[PDB]
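Box S1 | Example of a co-folding query
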Amino acid sequence: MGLEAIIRKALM
Amino acid sequence: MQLNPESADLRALAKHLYDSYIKSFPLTKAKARAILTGKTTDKSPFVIYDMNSLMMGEDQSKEVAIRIFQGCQFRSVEAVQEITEYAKSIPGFVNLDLNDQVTLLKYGVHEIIYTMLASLMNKDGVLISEGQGFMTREFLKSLRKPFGDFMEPKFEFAVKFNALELDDSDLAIFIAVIILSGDRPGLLNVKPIEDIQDNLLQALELQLKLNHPESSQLFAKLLQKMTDLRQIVTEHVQLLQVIKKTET
Ligand SMILES: *c1cc(F)c(C(=O)NCc2ccc(F)cc2COCCOC)cc1C(=O)Nc1ccc(C(F)(F)F)cc1C
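Box S1 (continued) | Returned holo structure for Q8F
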């Protein structure tokens, strides 16, 4: 949740 | 074993993850080992070994145990970012279903954080602030419950792992093998993940054979570690919620 947020942003 | 087209392509893939890895994690295991072992021209880290050395070290929360955990938290966020960045340079990964890319990194970052920490650890403690500081194992242990115990399983794992003497060339492909684990819960297209992992596992075996003449079954024992790391990250995840329930 806090994790998926940051991971999708980094993938961007 | 023969040096042939397939072997030379496993070597190019190893080299491509190595460069990509040196990009994403500035503080490499090599410069981490020169700093721990004193063999560097670089600045000497400041040792936090008691409450007094921590004060000068800092040179908001009132509680030094909380404040350290917060610092640990932020680096983790940055680490999750660096691991994702690395993952983008693993041939095949950006092409996978976006949701699957997310489950992989979701369920993998904690295993990769344990691995990268070992690189920054000796028996005395862990490098902090990009090598600018060093915090002793026994002082981190000296923090009140439940913080005193947070890093100890990291040190336990790091003590036996570092004994394998893996370098950056090995570690890059170790980490790529972890990220493409076809057993992470809720993975929409497994068969494609396992295809990248099979290529990565050949790249790993060739690497370790060429790089470790005295460790005949080191490939087998890196797989045992990737197993070790499943229960470790569970134990970390489950105490990491204890702190969410008991610390405001
Ligand atoms: C230190 C404290 C800490 F609380 C964590 C941690 O794992 N927090 C959870 C977290 C972290 C980052 C993030 F984006 C989301 C979340 C929430 O996730 C839920 C958990 O369930 C799956 C971690 C540490 C720690 O490991 N600190 C750290 C990591 C890596 C390095 C590096 F130097 F090796 F790169 C250094 C440190 C200090």
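The helical segments of chain A are 2-11. The interface with chain B takes residues 3-4, 6-8, 10-11 of chain A (CB under 8 Å).
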